[PDB]
Every structure is written in structure tokens, then in C-alpha cells.
Design a protein around this ligand. Structure first.
Ligand SMILES: O=c1ccn([C@@H]2O[C@H](COP(=O)(O)OP(=O)(O)O[C@H]3O[C@H](CO)[C@@H](O)[C@H](O)[C@H]3O)[C@@H](O)[C@H]2O)c(=O)[nH]1
Ligand SMILES: O=c1ccn([C@@H]2O[C@H](COP(=O)(O)OP(=O)(O)O[C@H]3O[C@H](CO)[C@@H](O)[C@H](O)[C@H]3O)[C@@H](O)[C@H]2O)c(=O)[nH]1
Ligand SMILES: O=C(O)CCOP(=O)(O)O
Ligand SMILES: O=C(O)CCOP(=O)(O)O
Ligand SMILES: [Mn+2]
Ligand SMILES: [Mn+2]
Lengths: 279, 279
């Protein structure tokens, strides 16, 4: 019931560029300690810059490895969380990085690509902007691909429980997606790893499915992470998913026993629509 | 904040038997197509029968392999779902099997052990009944052990969200546990894989933490299952967890794309306290 592109899109890069019609395109790579993979990601996209893509930045989210220098050495403009929006003290987590990135870009369209990807296709970005450029009323495009543990155990089943209309979204937690600035600066940003699911639900609640498309980027592979770190992500995802369905979340961080005790942070605080930051 | 036994319990089998004080003990092994492991499980426990354990049954939950014959050949009494409670048509899923098993046993105490376990300790049952026998006010004992994907990504984080008081339960989805008949026949049984989480939350809501204990059974290993089957389990878990927290579940089955479409069953229907079936 949702515009789904199942096979390779047929649009060429030159067509897509024509279709821009004065609209600009920014690409954001959020990055926290992805030195091993960041360069490969930037290189997959930088050939588009000054063409289809008018602007590409790395939003460095507090990295302490060589993420930033290697990214710079790949010719990318690197922006710290502090630099994107310096008047506002920095909070931890991905959603903060993406939210701040709105203040550090000016494209009418914004594309997000995770910086921990292993050999991403150089057509990811063209594939994602296709529906925004050539559709009508599309404001949001999610990717999917071909094993998604938080997605298949947490997000998809909870959506089935609480927003079953979104059951047709194959990769709701996908980190590769694009959306209009008009949409993005109109929506709040959930903290931490909650940011994607919030955007999907907020978009839907506000514009319905017809405003959402999804595109097959084939197959992704990325940094596989330790189960305890996913419990933490899953917690924040849950937190946000619930607060969008008007359910009071305890605000209690998930506690695991490695036996040694550890309690991960959770946040019930969204960033407001970036629009409010407009002077 | 919950009675937790972290190391090997010190009670001997003969002490525990003395402590029974006229109370009887039934052990139930629910089983659906566990021919490879069922015999090992029965053998771990049958030496206790006519001693500490007064009764042991296998609740055969519709098996079509050699589960039943191999179980019989290990000297176990085998009871079909139909035989446990024949006046009532059989529904699919684990909770149904466990619920029916109450009608097919008469122990004052009931112990559940999954039948897909690989080399279970012969002390599992003594370890589980310890707190029921020697405690006061304990009506429920959960096991834990030393990677628990639905548990760590779905159940523990959701509990943190919705019943954070149960955050201290290490293995809420554990299939090895024991409880009083008085408690069990007083509680409804969630369908499918929802049965455990429901029992934990219902018990807590009704008696609080002081009625619950948990015991380290060291380390379990069992049938590792395909992610898509866990999505289905996770769905039912979610469904039940939500309905206990007064949250309306859509009643919509989880839908996955293997790309081929498949929609798994979910049930919003509990069995009533078995007490109501008392003539
Ligand atoms: O505080 C952070 C954490 C992560 N990231 C970046 O965000 C991307 C995704 O983070 P990651 O740790 O790889 O998350 P995943 O395990 O891949 O989580 C999946 O599901 C999450 C829930 O929405 C999404 O954030 C991810 O994009 C998605 O791939 C990575 O490139 C990170 O460099 C930050 O910039 N800051
Ligand atoms: O319809 C069914 C399904 C399962 N079982 C038996 O129940 C036990 C547990 O089922 P399983 O498929 O192994 O579930 P798990 O993946 O191990 O799920 C974990 O989490 C579940 C959620 O509560 C619990 O039911 C399990 O006991 C627990 O180990 C097994 O011995 C099965 O033989 C049935 O009797 N009938
Ligand atoms: O967002 C998710 O679904 C978790 C991604 O990690 P993985 O389970 O290894 O694919
Ligand atoms: O109940 C659970 O947590 C799922 C058990 O299977 P596994 O993740 O392989 O340990
Ligand atoms: Mn990743
Ligand atoms: Mn199992």
C-alpha cells in the first residue's frame, strides 16, 4: 500500500540532475568512530558533488579515532556537532547529529547515508532521490535491502502492534534515506538511535503513506555490533516508538548483567522542529 | 530488589524431599517436534520420580516426528493436548500446552522445563523448587543462565519501558521455571510464546516481587532458531506484554518479506484461570 520500487531504478544521473529544477541536494554522513569505512563511503558519493549533489558533509559526532582526518583527506567538508549549531550545547547520540546537520546544510533535499557501510554502491544517492525528484507529494524515501535484528525483532513487530499501517515498510530503521528540508525542519528529532523510527511515524501521522516511498538499494552490510549495544539501541527505539503512540515510557534505562551490572542511558527528550531555531 | 540465588544452591535432594511436607511436585515438559533432545531431558529428571518429583509428564503439543515414541521409550507419561482437556478444542501454541498441562497434573507445585534443551543438568528441578519449598510467600521461580535475542532486544527493554520494577529479572522469557498450582490455576495463560511474559507480569501485579525468586541454572543451550521465527515469537510476546499494560494491540500479525510475502498469526486471546474449569 506504499510506493515501493523493487528493482533497479531506470533514471540516469543526467536526467535526475535536470529534474532538480533549482532544488539543491545535500548529503550527510553522520559519523562516530568509523575510520575504517568512512573513506569508502565518501568516495562512493563525492563524484556527484557539483553535479547532482550540490553539497556533501560529514557530521562528526565526537569521533576520537582518525575519522575526521581521513574524511578530510577524502576531500569532504567535516562539521562537528558544535560547529553545526554552536549556540546550543551538544547532546550525545545519532538523532542529535542528524538534527544538527540540518543547520549545517541548505539543500532543499537532504540525504542521509551511514558512514559505517562496507563498499556502498555509488548509486545509493541517485536511487534515494529518484522518488523525491520525479514523484508528486513524496517527502520521504526509505531504503531497503537483503540480519536486521533490532528491525525484525523490535521495530517491525512493534509497528505491527501500534502502527500496522506501516507494516509494509521493509527497513524502517534504515539509515540510508532522504527527505525534503521542508519536511525535516518541520519534524522533531528523537534522541539517540530513536531518530529514524520517529521520523517514519511522524511523517506518516502527518502526511500518510502517499508521502512515503521506499527504494531497494540491493544489499547492505555494515558494522556488526555486540548484542548488549543493541539492547541499548532497542531500548531507545522502543522509548521513541511508544511516545509517538501516546504511551508513557518509564524513562528507565535498560539494565544488563554481564555477573556485573550496567545501566544504559535512555532519553525521552526530542529536539524540536529545527524550524523553531530560525531567527 | 528480587530474591536472587546467584550460585549453586546448597540444599540436598533428601532435605528438599523432607521439606515437601505433603505437597506434591509435578514436572511438565512441553514438546513440539523435539525428538532429538527430548530423551536427554526426560532422563535428566526421571530419576527423581517417586522421590522429590511425584509426577512427570510430556505434554505433546502436536508433534509429527518421533517425539512421542522416544519419550514413551524413556518411560515418560505422554499426554496430548487433546487428552489433557478433551472437552475443549485444541488451539496452537506453547501457552495452550502449558495451560492444558495444569489439567493433566495434580502437584501442589508445577515445574516447566523446555524439551529442546541440550544436556540439561539433572539438578535443574531441585534448583527450581528450592525457593518454593524453603521460602515463605514465594509462588514463582524463574531460572537464569549464561545470546537471548528476543529476551535482550524485546522483553527486557520493554519491561524497562513498562514494568521497570521487573528490570531485575534476568531471564523473563526463561522456559525453565516453577510455580504453585494455586498461583497457576489462578492466572490466565497467554497464547503462543506469550505465556511466560504474561505469567511474570500477572504474578508481579498480583503478588509483587517478594513472591518471585530466580535461580541460576548455570548455562543453557538450546535449539537456535531462524530469525523470521523469532520475529513471530517477538510479535506475540509484544502483544501480550502490551495487553498486560493496558495498551491496545492492533491484533495484526507480523508480516515479513523473504521477495516473498508471509504473515504470521498473532493471538490476543488468553486462556482464563484454569480454576474456572473446575466443575
Ligand atoms: O552517536 C552516534 C551513533 C551513531 N552514529 C552514526 O550513525 C550511523 C548508524 O549508527 P550504528 O551504530 O551503525 O547503528 P546501526 O546498528 O546500524 O542501527 C540501525 O538502526 C538504527 C536505528 O534507527 C539506525 O540509527 C542505523 O542507521 C541503522 O543502520 C553510523 O554511521 C554511526 O557512525 C553517530 O553519528 N553518532
Ligand atoms: O507450539 C509450541 C511451541 C513450542 N513448544 C515447546 O516449548 C518449548 C519452547 O519453545 P521454543 O520454540 O524452543 O522457544 P524459544 O526460542 O526457546 O523461546 C524462549 O522464549 C519463549 C518466550 O516465552 C519461551 O516460550 C521459551 O521457553 C524460551 O526458551 C520447546 O521445548 C517446545 O518444544 C510447544 O510445546 N508448543
Ligand atoms: O537495525 C538493525 O536491525 C540492527 C542492524 O544490525 P544487524 O542485526 O547485525 O543487521
Ligand atoms: O528467548 C530468547 O531470548 C530467544 C532464545 O534464542 P537465542 O537468541 O538463540 O538464545
Ligand atoms: Mn550500522
Ligand atoms: Mn528453545
Amino acid at each position: 500500500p506504499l510506493d515501493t520500487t523493487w528493482h533497479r531504478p531506470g533514471w540516469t544521473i543526467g536526467e535526475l540532475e535536470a529534474a532538480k529544477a533549482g532544488r539543491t541536494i545535500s548529503v550527510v554522513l553522520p559519523a562516530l568512530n568509523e575510520e575504517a569505512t568512512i573513506e569508502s563511503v565518501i568516495d562512493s558519493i563525492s563524484p556527484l558533488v557539483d553535479g547532482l549533489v550540490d553539497e556533501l558533509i560529514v557530521l562528526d559526532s565526537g569521533s576520537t579515532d582518525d575519522t575526521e582526518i581521513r574524511a578530510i583527506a577524502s576531500g569532504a567538508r567535516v562539521v562537528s556537532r558544535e560547529q553545526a549549531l554552536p549556540e546550543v550545547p551538544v547532546r550525545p547520540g545519532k538523532g542529535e547529529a542528524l538534527w544538527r546537520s540540518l543547520a549545517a546544510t541548505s539543500g532543499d533535499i537532504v540525504v542521509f547515508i551511514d558512514s559505517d557501510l562496507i563498499n556502498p554502491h555509488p548509486l545509493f544517492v541517485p536511487w534515494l532521490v529518484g522518488p523525491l525528484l520525479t514523484g508528486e507529494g513524496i517527502q520521504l524515501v526509505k531504503s531497503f535491502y537483503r540480519g536486521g535484528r533490532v528491525t525484525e525483532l523490535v521495530a517491525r513487530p512493534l509497528l505491527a502492534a501500534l502502527r500496522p499501517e506501516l507494516g509494509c515498510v521493509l527497513q524502517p530503521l534504515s539509515g540510508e534515506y532522504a527527505a525534503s528540508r521542508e519536511l525535516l525542519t518541520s519534524l522533531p528529532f528523537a534522541p539517540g538511535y530513536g531518530v529514524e523510527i520517529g521520523l517514519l511515524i511522524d511523517t506518516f501521522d502527518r502526511l500518510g503513506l502517499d508521502a512515503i516511498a521506499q527504494v531497494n538499494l540491493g544489499v547492505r552490510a555494515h558494522r556488526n555490533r555486540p548484542l548488549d549495544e543493541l539492547g541499548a539501541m532497542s531500548r531507545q527505539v522502543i522509548a521513541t516508538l511508544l511516545s509517538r503512540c501516546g504511551i508513557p515510557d518509564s524513562g528507565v534505562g535498560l539494565t544488563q548483567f554481564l555477573y556485573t551490572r550496567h545501566t544504559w542511558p535512555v532519553s525521552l527528550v526530542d529536539r524540536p522542529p529545527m524550524k523553531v531555531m530560525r531567527p
